[PDB]
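Inputs:
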Amino acid sequence: QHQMFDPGVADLLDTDILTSPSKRKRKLKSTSDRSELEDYIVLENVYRMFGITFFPLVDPIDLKIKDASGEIFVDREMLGIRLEVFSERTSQFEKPHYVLLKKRIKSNSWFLFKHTIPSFIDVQGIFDDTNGGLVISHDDAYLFAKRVFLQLVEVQKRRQIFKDLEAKKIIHDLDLDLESSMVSFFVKDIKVELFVKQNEIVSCSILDDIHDFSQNNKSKWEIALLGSLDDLELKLNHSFA
Amino acid sequence: KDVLDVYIKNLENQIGNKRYFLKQAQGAIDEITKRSLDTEGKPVNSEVFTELLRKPPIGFSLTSNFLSLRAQSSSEWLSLMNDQSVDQKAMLLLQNNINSDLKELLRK
Amino acid sequence: PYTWKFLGISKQLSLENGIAKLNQLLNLEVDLDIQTIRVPSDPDGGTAADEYIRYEMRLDISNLDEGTYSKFIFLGNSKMEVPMFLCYCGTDNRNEVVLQWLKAEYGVIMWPIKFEQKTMIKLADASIVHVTKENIEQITWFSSKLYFEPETQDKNLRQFSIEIPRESCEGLALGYGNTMHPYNDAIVPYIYNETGMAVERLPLTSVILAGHTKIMRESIVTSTRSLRNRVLAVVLQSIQF
Amino acid sequence: SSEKQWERIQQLEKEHVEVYRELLITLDRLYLIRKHNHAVILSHTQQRLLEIRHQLQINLEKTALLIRLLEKPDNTNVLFTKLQNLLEESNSLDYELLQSLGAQSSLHKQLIESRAER
Amino acid sequence: LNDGKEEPEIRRLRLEKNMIKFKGSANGVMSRYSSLVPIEKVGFTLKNEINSRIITIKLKFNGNDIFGGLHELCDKNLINIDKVPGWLAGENGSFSGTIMNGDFQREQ
Amino acid sequence: RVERINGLTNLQKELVTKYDTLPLLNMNLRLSYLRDHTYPHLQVSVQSRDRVHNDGIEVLVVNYKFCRNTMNPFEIQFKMFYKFEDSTLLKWEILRISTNVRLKAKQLLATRNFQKCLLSLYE
C-alpha cells in the first residue's frame, strides 16, 4: 500500500476505511427493498382493480409544533378518494377522479374542502345528506365515496356503450354533452335526440322527415326507443330499416 | 456523462475519506492535547522539527483551483485598477486646469 | 389640512440674536417663543438629555389660512451632534426668504429630511399619546390604516392596505398588556403572525390615523393646528447618525 | 449535460484543497505533539517554515498531476481538455496586469509633480 | 424576522418551495410569477378571538396579479412562506370572503 | 437539508417536507387505505407473479378471502395477464372458488369488468 499517510502518520491515524469501504459506506447508506416494493405495488394494482379507491392526503399549512418535545403534528385530518372506472372499451382505465375531505376545528366532523368531481355532481349535497351531514366514520366516508363513484360509473357506462355503437358503425357521427345525458346521432340518415338518466332513456325525439316516416311510424319508433340502454343496441339494429 | 459521473463519485468518495481523516485527526488532537493536561506548551525542538523536515485526482483539484482563482481575481485587479486610473486621470487633468488657471492668477 | 415640511440645521444658531435683521428683511416683526421641555419623561425613554429648547416663530400678517398662519418651529439641544432642525407649514414663499436669511446670516448649511418605515411607526405611536395635567400618560385610539405601494413585475401587485379600526387596535394593545407604543409593540407582530408579513420591511407609503393626522414620506399632515412635542422630539432623534 | 457535474467538481475541488490543507496543518503538528505530548507552542518562524514547506508541497503535487496530464497530451480525459484552457488563461492574462501595474506609478508621479507645482 | 454566505442548491429548493406554495407544482404549472388565472382585486376580513375579544383585520389588495406579486415579495424575502395562509396563497381563488374558525366563507 | 423520497419513504419526513398537495406516495399507506379502510375483511394475497420478459407480459394469480363471516369465509382466485406497457389488460381467469359461494357468485363472475365482481362480492 502506497503512503496515503506517512508511515509515521498511519501509525496513529485509522486506516480501516481504506482497508474496507464498508466502514465508510456505513455512514453514506437496498436490493431487498427494490424487489419487495415489487410485489406490494403489484397488489396495489390489484386493489386499484376495484375502482373505488381511498388514497391518503394532507394539507401543508395545518402543521404545527407541540412546544415541549420539539415534534410536529397535523391539526386537521384529510382523506383522499380516487375514482377509477374500468374502460372495457379499451381494456384500460379512464383518467381518475378525486374528492378530498377535511375535519372541522371544533365539531370533530368532516367537511368537503377540495375535490375534482365536476359541478354537475353535487358532492356537497351528497356529503350534507350522509348521516344527516355529520360525516364522522370512515364507513360514512365510504358511503359518500361509493355514491359519487356510482354516479361517475353511471356516466362512463353510457359513454362506453355509445362509443361502442359508433365503433361498429351502428350509428353515424354523434355529439355528446359532458356527462353523456343528452346525446345526438345520425343512425343512417335519420337523426335522433335522446335524454337519458342512469342506465335508462327517459325521452326521445326523431327530427328527420322521410316518406315512410309517417307520424304513426314516428310515434311508435320514438316510444320503442325508450327503456333501458342495454336493449337500445339490439332494438336499433332490429329497426335498422 | 460517465467520465464525469465516475470522477464525481471518486472525488466524493475521496472527500468522504478526507472528512473521516479530519474527524479522526481532530479526535487525536483532542486526546493528545488532553495528554497535554497543562495549558503550557512544550518548546517544539529543532531536531524534532528537523525530522519533521525529513519525512512527509488530488493534484487535478489543486491545479484547477489555483488556476481558476488565478483567472478572475487577476481580471478583477486590473479592472478595479484601470477604473482607478481613468477617473484619477480625470482628476489630474481637472487638477492641471485649475493649476494652469491659477498659475496665471499668480502672474496676475 | 395642516401640512408640514422639515429641514435640518448644521449649527445651534441663537435665533433671538438676529431677529431684527430678519424683521427688516421680511418688512414685518415676527414673534419668538422660548420653551425648555422635557418630552421623553417616561423612564425607559430617559430622564436626562430631555432638555430640548423649542422656538415658535410666525409670519402672521394674518391667520386666515395656513400660508398666512405659517409658523416656524426650531427645536435644538447642545448635546446633539447636529444640534437643531426646522419645521414650517403652508405654501407661502416668505418661508423661502427666511431660510435664505438663515443660511446667508449664520453661515449655516441646511437640507431636507426623510423618514424610514420604522421612523413612521414610531411617529404614529408618538401621535396618539397625550399627557394629563397630573403628569400621567394617556392614549387616544384612532382607526389606523397602513397603506403600502410596492414595485413588482408587470404591476402584479400595485398597492395594498391594512385597515385596523379603533376597537381592534385597543384590543391588541390590551392583549399585549399595559404598554406605551402599541403600534410597534403589538399590532405589527399580530399582522406578521396572521400573514407572515413584515410591515417594517414592506414598502410603506403612509400611516393614516383617521381624523387625527396623516404621516407621509416627506411631510406630516395634522388635524390640529400644531404638533405635540413628542412628534418633534421623534423627528429630531431621527435626524441623527 | 456534463457541465453540471463539471461545476459540481469546480466547487468540490475548492472543498478538497481547503480540507487537504487543514489536514496537513493537523498532520504536521499532530506528529510534533506525538513527539512531545504538549508540543503546541510552535513558533511564528517555525510555523512559517512549515507553511513554506506546505506551499512547496502544493508546488510538487500540482506539478505531479500536470505531468500526469501533459506528459502524454492524449486528450482522452475530457477534464484534461478543460484543464488546457484553464492553464491557457492563467498565463494569457498576466501581461495586462504587469503593464498597468507599471504605468500607474508614472501616472501617480504626474499627480505628485502637479501637487508640488500647486 | 432576525435576518452573501449562501450556496446554490438550497436556494434553488427554497425557490421551489415558494413556487409550489404559490403554484402547487415544482415545475410550476401556469414568467415564474404569472399565475393560472390572474386576480386583480381581493378583499379579506380576518375575525379572531383573543381574550374573549373579537378582532378584525381587513386586507385589500389591488393589481394585475395579487398572488404573483406576493410570490415575488416572498422571493425577495419580505414575507415568510411558512406563515402565509392558504386563503392568502390563492385558494378560494376569485372569492373575496371572511375567514372564521380556519374556514373560508364567501362574502354574501 | 435536502432529501430523496419514494414509495418506501417514512411518512414523518414526507410530512415534514410536505409543502405540496399531491397524494401521499407512502405505499403501505395506499395499500392500507385500499385494504382496511375501503375494503375491510378482504384478506387477499398474490400467489404467483412471474413476468415473461421475452413477451413483456406480467402474469398474476391472486387469491382473495372475504372474512366478514369468519365462521365460513368464502374465497376466490384470479389469474390475470396485462401488457405491462401502455396500461392494458390481456385476460383474467378465475382459477378457484370456495364451494360455499360457487353457485351464488358464478353469475357475477360470469360477468366481465372485474371491478364489478370484486366489489360486489365485498358488498
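The CA atoms of residues 188 and 241 of chain A lie 9 Å apart. Flag for discussion at group meeting.
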